[PDB]
Amino acid sequence: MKFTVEREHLLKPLQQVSGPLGRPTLPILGNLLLQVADGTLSLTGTDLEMEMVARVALVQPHEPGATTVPARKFFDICRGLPEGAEIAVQLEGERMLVRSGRSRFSLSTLPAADFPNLDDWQSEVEFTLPQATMKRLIEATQFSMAHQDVRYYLNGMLFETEGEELRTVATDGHRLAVCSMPIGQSLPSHSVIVPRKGVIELMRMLDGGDNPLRVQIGSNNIRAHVGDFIFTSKLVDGRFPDYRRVLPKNPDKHLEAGCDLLKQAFARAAILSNEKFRGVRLYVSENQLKITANNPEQEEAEEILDVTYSGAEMEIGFNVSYVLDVLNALKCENVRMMLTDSVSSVQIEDAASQSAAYVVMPMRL
Amino acid sequence: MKFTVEREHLLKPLQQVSGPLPILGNLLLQVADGTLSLTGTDLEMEMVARVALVQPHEPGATTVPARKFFDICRGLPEGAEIAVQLEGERMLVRSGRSRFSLSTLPAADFPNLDDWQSEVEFTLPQATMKRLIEATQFSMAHQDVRYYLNGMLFETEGEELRTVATDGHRLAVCSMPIGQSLPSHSVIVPRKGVIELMRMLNPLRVQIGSNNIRAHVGDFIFTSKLVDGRFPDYRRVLPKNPDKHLEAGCDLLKQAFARAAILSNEKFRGVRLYVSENQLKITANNPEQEEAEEILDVTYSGAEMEIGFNVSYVLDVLNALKCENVRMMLTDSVSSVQIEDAASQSAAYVVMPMRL
Ligand SMILES: O=C(O)c1cc2[nH]c3c(c2cc1Cl)CCCC3
Ligand SMILES: [Ca+2]
Ligand SMILES: [Ca+2]
Ligand SMILES: [Ca+2]
Ligand SMILES: [Ca+2]
Ligand SMILES: [Ca+2]
Numbered sequence A: 001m002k003f004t005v006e007r008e009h010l011l012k013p014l015q016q017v018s019g020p021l022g023r024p025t026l027p028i029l030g031n032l033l034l035q036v037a038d039g040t041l042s043l044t045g046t047d048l049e050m051e052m053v054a055r056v057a058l059v060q061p062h063e064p065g066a067t068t069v070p071a072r073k074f075f076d077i078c079r080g081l082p083e084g085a086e087i088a089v090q091l092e093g094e095r096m097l098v099r100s101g102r103s104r105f106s107l108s109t110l111p112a113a114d115f116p117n118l119d120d121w122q123s124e125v126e127f128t129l130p131q132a133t134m135k136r137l138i139e140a141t142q143f144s145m146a147h148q149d150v151r152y153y154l155n156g157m158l159f160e161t162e163g164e165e166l167r168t169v170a171t172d173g174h175r176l177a178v179c180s181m182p183i184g185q186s187l188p189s190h191s192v193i194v195p196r197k198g199v200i201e202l203m204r205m206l207d208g209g210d211n212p213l214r215v216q217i218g219s220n221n222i223r224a225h226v227g228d229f230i231f232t233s234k235l236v237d238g239r240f241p242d243y244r245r246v247l248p249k250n251p252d253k254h255l256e257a258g259c260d261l262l263k264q265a266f267a268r269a270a271i272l273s274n275e276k277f278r279g280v281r282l283y284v285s286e287n288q289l290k291i292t293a294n295n296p297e298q299e300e301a302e303e304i305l306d307v308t309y310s311g312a313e314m315e316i317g318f319n320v321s322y323v324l325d326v327l328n329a330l331k332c333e334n335v336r337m338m339l340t341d342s343v344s345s346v347q348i349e350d351a352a353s354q355s356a357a358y359v360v361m362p363m364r365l
Numbered sequence B: 001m002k003f004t005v006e007r008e009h010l011l012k013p014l015q016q017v018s019g020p021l022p023i024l025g026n027l028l029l030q031v032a033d034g035t036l037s038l039t040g041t042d043l044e045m046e047m048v049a050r051v052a053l054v055q056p057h058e059p060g061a062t063t064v065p066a067r068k069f070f071d072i073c074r075g076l077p078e079g080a081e082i083a084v085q086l087e088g089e090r091m092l093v094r095s096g097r098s099r100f101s102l103s104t105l106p107a108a109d110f111p112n113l114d115d116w117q118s119e120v121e122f123t124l125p126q127a128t129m130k131r132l133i134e135a136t137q138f139s140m141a142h143q144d145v146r147y148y149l150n151g152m153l154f155e156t157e158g159e160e161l162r163t164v165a166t167d168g169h170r171l172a173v174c175s176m177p178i179g180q181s182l183p184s185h186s187v188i189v190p191r192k193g194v195i196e197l198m199r200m201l202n203p204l205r206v207q208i209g210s211n212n213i214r215a216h217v218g219d220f221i222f223t224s225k226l227v228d229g230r231f232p233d234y235r236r237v238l239p240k241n242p243d244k245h246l247e248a249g250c251d252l253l254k255q256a257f258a259r260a261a262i263l264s265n266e267k268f269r270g271v272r273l274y275v276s277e278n279q280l281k282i283t284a285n286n287p288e289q290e291e292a293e294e295i296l297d298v299t300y301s302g303a304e305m306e307i308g309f310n311v312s313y314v315l316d317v318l319n320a321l322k323c324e325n326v327r328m329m330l331t332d333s334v335s336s337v338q339i340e341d342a343a344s345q346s347a348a349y350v351v352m353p354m355r356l
Helices: A007-018 A073-078 A130-145 A197-202 A259-270 A321-329 B008-017 B067-075 B126-134 B191-199 B250-261 B311-321
Strands: A002-006 A031-037 A041-045 A050-057 A065-070 A087-091 A095-100 A103-108 A125-129 A155-169 A175-195 A212-217 A221-226 A229-234 A253-258 A279-285 A288-294 A299-304 A314-319 A333-341 A348-351 A353-360 B003-006 B027-030 B035-041 B046-051 B059-063 B081-087 B090-095 B098-103 B119-126 B151-157 B160-166 B170-177 B183-190 B203-207 B212-217 B220-225 B244-249 B271-277 B277-284 B290-297 B305-310 B324-331 B337-341 B348-353
Touching: A007 A031, A007 A041, A007 A073, A007 A087, A031 A073, A041 B183, A050 A197, A065 A073, A065 A229, A065 B191, A073 A103, A073 A155, A073 B212, A073 B250, A095 A314, A103 A197, A125 A175, A130 A155, A130 A197, A130 A212, A130 A321, A175 A197, A175 A321, A197 A229, A197 B035, A253 A259, A259 A279, A259 A288, A259 A299, A259 A321, A259 B067, A259 B098, A259 B160, A279 A321, A314 A321, A321 A353, A353 B305, B003 B008, B008 B035, B008 B046, B008 B067, B027 B067, B046 B191, B059 B067, B067 B098, B119 B126, B126 B160, B126 B191, B151 B191, B151 B250, B183 B191, B183 B220, B183 B290, B191 B220, B220 B311, B244 B250, B250 B271, B250 B277, B250 B290, B250 B311, B250 B324, B305 B311, B311 B348
Parallel strands: none
Antiparallel strands: A002 A087, A031 A041, A031 A065, A041 A050, A050 A229, A087 A095, A095 A103, A103 B290, A125 A212, A155 A175, A175 A353, A212 A221, A221 A229, A253 A333, A279 A288, A279 A314, A288 A299, A299 B098, A333 A348, A348 A353, B003 B081, B027 B035, B027 B059, B035 B046, B046 B220, B081 B090, B090 B098, B119 B203, B151 B160, B151 B183, B160 B170, B170 B348, B203 B212, B212 B220, B244 B324, B271 B277, B271 B305, B277 B290, B324 B337, B337 B348
């Protein structure tokens, strides 16, 4: 194996493939697979559940072959080299030698034959969509995912195809987020759970260019194709909850308010809320919302806002962190809070769009 | 106590006094004459800020949580007026239609530092004191049992102010002329107070006493206790005669160190240096049998030798230097090495050799 590549053509691909890799349990998991074949350098990083592949064209003389080298060490060397540095790489048995100017580097290798290989799988549904659409879908729901839960299925994100739309669903049991976006393609119905790190990697590969994203989904796998990068991940088997049964059936009390004004009022009030439970009180009356928070230290905050509201008065408690999470994810001018009573969930949406909806459970305080 | 003041005039002062026991997490607010005074402390050091009050005000003093009162004022929108009044066991904060009642502790209970006399006084530009601290800060010890090293020596001599810092493995010296005739004096400022003095940096007026150090800049006053101990003489740490002189490009030397370090030992990162005529070879290796080598064009001419260095110690020096050319003054394979900028003698750095 032999290749010479300019620093900047190797740098970003190296960062991408290293994504799925802190403390590797076994030595080979800390390594990247390098392959030179048909004038192309393929790089691969894995964690047994997912793979990130980068393909790099070779304009300089090269020789076929494959080896694995430490990801972090090889990335650090290339990054450390000066801009425009020519990086000559050759496999020499047990070591891979890296040369650039009068800089010399020798890396430990493990056989390419020993590198983990995710089994082949048959695609069942395929569609293309803009990178921006995928970014929107992930950023709207990502925060609602559970962290290291025993209910493994909640630690991921549901991906749903229905009609002309692609949909994401995330919930941690306490609060729910759901976002739908049209893609202009007739789709069958699949409901697959994408793991936590898979959601991160999907988000990582969107460089904000106009390169379309090609998505393939199977019974047990998902694949995402952006530019010269191919991401494959195994899916999480389980029974993910339906969002249609979590959405409030009867929201009779609709409140409309400025998103940023609601956000900054909640943020100021949060300062004096209970440090563990993060509870804020909401009193809603005609065209006005009052936000109050108190902690065991006997401290009190109060905020008063002009809103649009015609319904009956009610008092309701919320975990302020959940509300602030929703409002930061919406990033719009006007927000809509769909209420029922003090013991039922709220539905929070963008006032101008039904494409995203949020459900937060009420709180006793 | 009662005052109404613009948000703009509180933001900067609040940030400075929240720099440095339950009462230590609070800020002392005093209203006297036509001034609001804000004080934060950690028992060792103290930061006082003054802000003028033109709106109807009432004199008095209380204490309120530092992080909370700051987060409230900063959380409010720009152009907001902030009305504050003490009402029994609570301080009421009002702006627009935002209300805040914070828990209080009496002003009489707030820990004030003992009164002390100034023995040495001098004024110097902000940029000079920044320069003096920046050049030596990294060489301070962190949690060493030798408490006198957990800080920085401030020395006056002739017309110069000098900072010295050492962790026993590497030492840093920097001298700057301030244009004033000074008495010879040395004091040790605690590392926490050193970093605080750095953040507040229009001349700075400095007052040094037997057990305290004070700094006046703008409308802020920083007072800190001194570390009571005997600090090592830098004059005896500098090598007697480093006859071997290596001159290298600062950035090239930096990058060649950072790249080689990648393949050194993860626990104690060191590189080997082979010096010959107009060439420097930087090598490194690890328990995985991995090797790095960096060849550099330099200016030397002296005798060939091999010497190892801790990567972090050298990089720290080169990052402080921020210059074109670095001069490395060597003696032998087992002795300390002096590092300086090639064009200036203001700063000197001494690093122990490392065995690899
Ligand atoms: O390596 C050196 O030149 C060196 C020598 C030193 N001798 C002493 C210290 C010291 C530091 C260095 Cl860097 C600090 C504590 C007092 C005695
Ligand atoms: Ca080799
Ligand atoms: Ca003022
Ligand atoms: Ca000032
Ligand atoms: Ca030699
Ligand atoms: Ca050696």
